[PDB]
Amino acid sequence: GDSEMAVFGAAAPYLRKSEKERLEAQTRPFDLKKDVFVPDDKQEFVKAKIVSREGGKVTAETEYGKTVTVKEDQVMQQNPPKFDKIEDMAMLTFLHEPAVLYNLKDRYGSWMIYTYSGLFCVTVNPYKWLPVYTPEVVAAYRGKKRSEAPPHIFSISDNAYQYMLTDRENQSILITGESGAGKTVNTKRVIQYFAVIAAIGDRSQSPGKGTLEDQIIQANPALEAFGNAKTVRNDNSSRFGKFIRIHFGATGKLASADIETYLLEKSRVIFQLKAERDYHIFYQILSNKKPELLDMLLITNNPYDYAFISQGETTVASIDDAEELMATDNAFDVLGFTSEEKNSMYKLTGAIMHFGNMKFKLKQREEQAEPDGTEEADKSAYLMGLNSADLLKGLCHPRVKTKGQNVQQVIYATGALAKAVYERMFNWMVTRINATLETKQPRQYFIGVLDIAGFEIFDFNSFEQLCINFTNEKLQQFFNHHMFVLEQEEYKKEGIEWTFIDFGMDLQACIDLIEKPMGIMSILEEECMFPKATDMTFKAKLFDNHLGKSANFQKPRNIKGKPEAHFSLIHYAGIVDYNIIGWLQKNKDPLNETVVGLYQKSSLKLLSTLFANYFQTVSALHRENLNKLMTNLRSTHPHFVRCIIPNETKSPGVMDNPLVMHQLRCNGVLEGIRICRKGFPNRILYGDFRQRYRILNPAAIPEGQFIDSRKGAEKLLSSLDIDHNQYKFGHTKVFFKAGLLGLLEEMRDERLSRIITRTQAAEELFTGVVPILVELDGDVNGHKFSVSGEGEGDATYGKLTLKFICTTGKLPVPWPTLVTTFVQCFSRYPDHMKRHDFFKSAMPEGYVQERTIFFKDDGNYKTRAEVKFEGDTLVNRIELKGIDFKEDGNILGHKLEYNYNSHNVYIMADKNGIKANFKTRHVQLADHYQQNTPIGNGPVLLPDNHYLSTQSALSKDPNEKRDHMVLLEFVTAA
Ligand SMILES: COC(=O)N1CCN(Cc2cccc(NC(=O)Nc3ccc(C)nc3)c2F)CC1
């Protein structure tokens, strides 16, 4: 309702449309039989309208106008309009891939970027400023359960906070997405929200300016200068994963915080694709906004003077590198870094710029490298606190147990050293930030925010992707297991006896293949400890150990125009081809240990600290960090946020179906649907079930007040031709397999469809004024008489007007005893009761109206009429037989008044017809026992218990010689 949305002010249209909008959208034309989804080559899925069918093929017209034919089993139902832009997609009737996709797309196209799907909060990058993050919207989300407000990431944050205070247990919020999907912005939103609402925070010996909240928030511009970069998909992309824990003490007050980082993209430091930059800090320093830095670093202000940082782009329209240097330098001040610490970091950064400018050439006629120039090597060693001759001597002639390098190797070696200094500098800075955020105030609970690259499949997938995907496999298993426990709780609460093996188990084989002994990483680790091992011997040890034995391990699918791969892995998100060139190298990450010896002895304390503790391979460390991350996550109640990148052109409002589909298959959303689908995903309250699927068998669910809805559903379902094992009865709901409710929904559309046909046929049979002929042949107490009637009928107004003439003299019985006997098909059924118009539905074949009228005093009429169309005219042909009538009685002795009273005709059903019962007052009592039955061996509408309200007006035509009756009757159903 609209008033509930008032509290959101200007944000409201971006969170939920008004009931006026929503009313319209849910009245749009829809045919469950024609409006479908079909697969599509270029778009994955598209809507389509079915045009024709034959031989188990379907022909349809795509929403793009393309004619297509497809196998019947490839056609999927659309959800009806009541479900348009639904806020939680777990409520959809049809919950297949295109239904999810098109709900997202519909919501996003109306500027609603947030959507729930079960546990998931789904966020679509808007590419546009939205007014939904104001203080007013913060206030309106405080303390609300998820269901009490529109979808929003504030809901996730506020609830995670309240769960911690209320349950006194750790919480985590897991945020994934592809690069550019908006993980980093969402992560900041969530942490800013904690800083706004968290209770402080009793005061007590720690570096930093401001409050802990200021410091937590300032860790961002600090880390982003060294860990973020202009990529093709995002001007400000994090190239590292991040887990931040915000700690609270025993009474719920903000206590401290710590950050862990993962998987910094080292390669970016010395290499860029054409449309990308290196990390921000290089261009920030180069902005000359703090000129003493250019002097301290022995550099110009031209990035193109530096090979490591100028292979792609060097300026970004959206980024003022000058302003950002101040933000970076300010952040290091707030976090309590000394000027020595700060400057030492700037120096190492300048040193790395120079490193990549050092040139080398070949000796006169040898294959040995020697320095070409020496200037840039000099500037570099100086900043690093090292001897320049020692540096260049280390590079060219390393010591083992000792020498030998060509130009290729030297160029390779300096590049690896640049990357290693930079990575270890990054870790150092994070540990220093952690030292500021450490307040030594007691901690009892935390809220962990994890922000890491999601599962991604590239054209070329190498060792780094394997690490990403392994992590995400472990994170998806974690979700599955959590989803399993909640499902069990739900089936238990409802008393449904169901179970299955833990959903997290489905991912165990993939995980074991990667992580157990003799698994892929174990082999890689074993192999790079062998000096003579090669990429080819590695390939072999994997195949020899797993091809044929581990089903998730497979031959590469070497597809189309995609680069060479060596094996393929079956992950939850799909099958991935891995290229294993260079993995022995990447895993052991060899460094020139002569030059590392110099770093260790540097006079610059920082550089010396960075290599102090210098065996461990990349994969062993990753395993260690992941295990530490998962132990933390498993101690929490988790919440999951999915970021979606809608398109590749930063365009607001528009979605590429395939891009979004890939993401949905990879990020857990479709996974979540699949595993709940193992059980009984569709759940319906007994009340809603009756008020929706009654029409399938109206007999088994009576009408009225106090109705036993569980019995109604148990009787109705038991009476259909369906797999009775595909539903179970809980305390308050019916649980359905997805296929079965989808069938009930098709059957309902079919039954509803037949009805609309039959009622339409039966109204265009009574459109216009309709001619009536009435014929009676009476026989009361042995005295025959005959009445004839002629008049006009008009069902639209529920009016009829007839003249009746006794064509055999004076009438043996009073005229008001023949009204009930003298065409209820002219009743006006309201525009909403029409399916209950039995009389019209029996036409033109007509119906038999048999009656038995017992009069109080006298005897009784036995009536049998046939009411059928007969040309363009409606004929009511009655035969009557009054018997055992008192000759002195108020009937036969013409005692009754010349008037009629209003009655209700109480209609029930039978089978193929109806039956009524009513008592007429004249004042003489008379009870009617009416039965109607069709005459055509064809379908008629049996109605729910209802009554006809009838009014009858007896008059005389003053000009009529013969004994007669003029009648006016007004009849309407209710
Ligand atoms: C991202 O995907 C996932 O994580 N999942 C989303 C969908 N899943 C399937 C599922 C499981 C449990 C209950 C429901 N449905 C619901 O509660 N009521 C309901 C109401 C009316 C009708 C026709 N069907 C059901 C349900 F869809 C739940 C997790």
Give bridge partners of residue 918 from the DSSP assignment: 928
- State which of 123, 676, 727 you would mutate to test the pocket of ligand 1, scoring each by most atoms of that ligand within 8 A of its C-beta: 676
Of 449, 452, 447, 448, give the one whose Cα is nearest residue 471. Answer: 452
Q: Is 447 in the pocket of ligand 1 (CB under 6 A)?
A: no
Q: Which residue has the tokens 């139902």?
A: 77
Resolution in A: 2.2
945 backbone dihedrals φ, ψ, rounded to 5°: -45, 115
Number of neighbours of residue 747 by Cβ within 10 angstroms:
16
Cα of 114 from ligand 1 centre, angstroms: 18
Q: Is 684 in the pocket of ligand 1 (CB under 6 A)?
A: yes
238 catalytic per annotation: yes
Give bridge partners of residue 790 from the DSSP assignment: 773, 803
Cα of 681 from ligand 1 centre, angstroms: 5
Q: Of 454, 679, 730, 742, which residue is the catalytic one?
A: 454
For ligand 1, what atom is nearest to the CA of residue 120?
1
Q: Are 61 and 49 in contact (CB under 8 A)?
A: yes
Distance between CA atoms of residues 187 and 220, nearest Å:
10
Cα of 646 from ligand 1 centre, angstroms: 24
What is the C-alpha R_g of the chain?
41
Q: CATH number of 453-637: 1.10.540.10, 1.10.390.10, 1.20.58.530, 1.10.132.20? A: 1.20.58.530
Q: Is 90 in the pocket of ligand 1 (CB under 6 A)?
A: yes
Q: Is 93 in the pocket of ligand 1 (CB under 6 A)?
A: yes
Q: Is 507 in the pocket of ligand 1 (CB under 6 A)?
A: no
Q: Are 304 and 194 in contact (CB under 8 A)?
A: no
Q: Of 184, 220, 349, 617, which residue is the catalytic one?
A: 184
SS3 581: coil
Report which secondary-structure segment, H or E, holds 571.
strand 567-571
In the chain, the N- to C-terminal Cα span, in Å, equals 31
Q: Are 327 and 221 in contact (CB under 8 A)?
A: yes
Number of neighbours of residue 855 by Cβ within 10 angstroms:
22
Sequence letter at residue 857: D
Distance between CA atoms of residues 831 and 853, nearest Å:
32
Cα of 682 from ligand 1 centre, angstroms: 6
Sequence letter at residue 430: V
Whether omega before 844 lies within 30 degrees of 0, making that bond cis, reads: yes
Chain breaks in the chain (C to N over 2.5 A) after: 204, 401, 614, 822, 911, 922
Q: Is 117 in the pocket of ligand 1 (CB under 6 A)?
A: yes
Show the DSSP H helices in 438-507 as ranges: 463-493
* Residue ID of nearest Cα to ligand 1 atom 12: 681
Please state how this structure was obtained: X-ray
Q: How far is CA 416 from the centre of its chain?
A: 44
Q: Are 950 and 822 in contact (CB under 8 A)?
A: no
Distance between CA atoms of residues 410 and 408, nearest Å:
6
Q: Is 92 in the pocket of ligand 1 (CB under 6 A)?
A: no
SS3 409: helix
DSSP structural state of residue 358 = -
949 catalytic per annotation: no
Q: Of 213, 224, 456, 527, which residue is the catalytic one?
A: 456
Q: Is 119 in the pocket of ligand 1 (CB under 6 A)?
A: yes
Cα–Cα distances in angstroms (integers) from residue 300 to residues 295, 742, 910, in the given order: 8, 69, 98
Cα of 91 from ligand 1 centre, angstroms: 6
* Residue ID of nearest Cα to ligand 1 atom 22: 682
Distance between CA atoms of residues 492 and 486, nearest Å:
10
454 catalytic per annotation: yes
782 catalytic per annotation: no
Torsion sign across C-alpha atoms 321, 324, 329, 332: negative
The secondary structure of 7-54 as a DSSP string is GGGGGGGGT---HHHHHHHTTS---TTTEEEEEETTTEEEEEEEEEEE
Number of neighbours of residue 191 by Cβ within 10 angstroms:
23
Of 490, 547, 504, give the one whose Cα is nearest residue 90. Answer: 490
Q: Of 234, 461, 820, 952, which residue is the catalytic one?
A: 234
Distance between CA atoms of residues 442 and 660, nearest Å:
44
613 catalytic per annotation: no
* Residue ID of nearest Cα to ligand 1 atom 28: 118
534 catalytic per annotation: no
What CATH number has the domain spanning 678-762?
Answer: 1.20.58.60
Of 932, 972, 967, 947, give the one whose Cα is nearest residue 774. Answer: 967
234 catalytic per annotation: yes
DSSP structural state of residue 279 = B
- State which of 78, 86, 95, 642 you would mutate to test the pocket of ligand 1, scoring each by most atoms of that ligand within 8 A of its C-beta: 95
Q: Are 422 and 414 in contact (CB under 8 A)?
A: no
Cα–Cα distances in angstroms (integers) from residue 355 to residues 196, 395, 397, in the given order: 44, 12, 17
* Residue ID of nearest Cα to ligand 1 atom 11: 681
Of 43, 85, 176, 185, give the one whose Cα is nearest residue 127. Answer: 185
Distance between CA atoms of residues 612 and 427, nearest Å:
13
Residue 24 contacts by C-beta under 8 Å, 6 or more apart in sequence?
none
Number of neighbours of residue 485 by Cβ within 10 angstroms:
13
Q: Which residue has the tokens 């001597």?
A: 393
- Known binding positions for ATP: 177-184
Show the DSSP H helices in 276-397 as ranges: 280-285, 291-296, 321-334, 339-355, 375-383, 388-396
Q: Of 123, 125, 237, 617, which residue is the catalytic one?
A: 237
Residue 21 contacts by C-beta under 8 Å, 6 or more apart in sequence?
none
Distance between CA atoms of residues 599 and 178, nearest Å:
37
Here the tokens at position 458 are 């590239």
Cα of 96 from ligand 1 centre, angstroms: 11
SS3 802: strand
493 backbone dihedrals φ, ψ, rounded to 5°: -60, -35
- The percent of the chain in helix, strand and coil, each rounded to the nearest 5, is 40, 25, 40
Q: Are 696 and 753 in contact (CB under 8 A)?
A: no
- Report the interhelical angle of 407-437 vs 212-227 (nearest 10°): 170
229 Rama sector, left if φ>0, alpha if ψ -120 to 50, beta otherwise: beta
Largest Cα–Cα separation, the chain: 148
Distance between CA atoms of residues 754 and 679, nearest Å:
33
Q: Is 307 in the pocket of ligand 1 (CB under 6 A)?
A: no
Strands ordered across the beta sheet of 553-554: 553-554, 567-571, 574-578
Sequence letter at residue 866: E
Cα of 186 from ligand 1 centre, angstroms: 25
Distance between CA atoms of residues 677 and 726, nearest Å:
12
Report which secondary-structure segment, H or E, holds 879.
strand 874-883
184 catalytic per annotation: yes
Q: Is 681 in the pocket of ligand 1 (CB under 6 A)?
A: yes
Q: Is 730 in the pocket of ligand 1 (CB under 6 A)?
A: no
847 backbone dihedrals φ, ψ, rounded to 5°: -145, 160
- Report the interhelical angle of 97-109 vs 657-666 (nearest 10°): 120
Cα of 930 from ligand 1 centre, angstroms: 49
- Positions of E strands within 426-560: 445-451, 553-554
* 770-780 and 874-883 beta bridge pairing: parallel
Q: How far is CA 455 from the centre of its chain?
A: 18
Torsion sign across C-alpha atoms 92, 148, 692, 29: negative
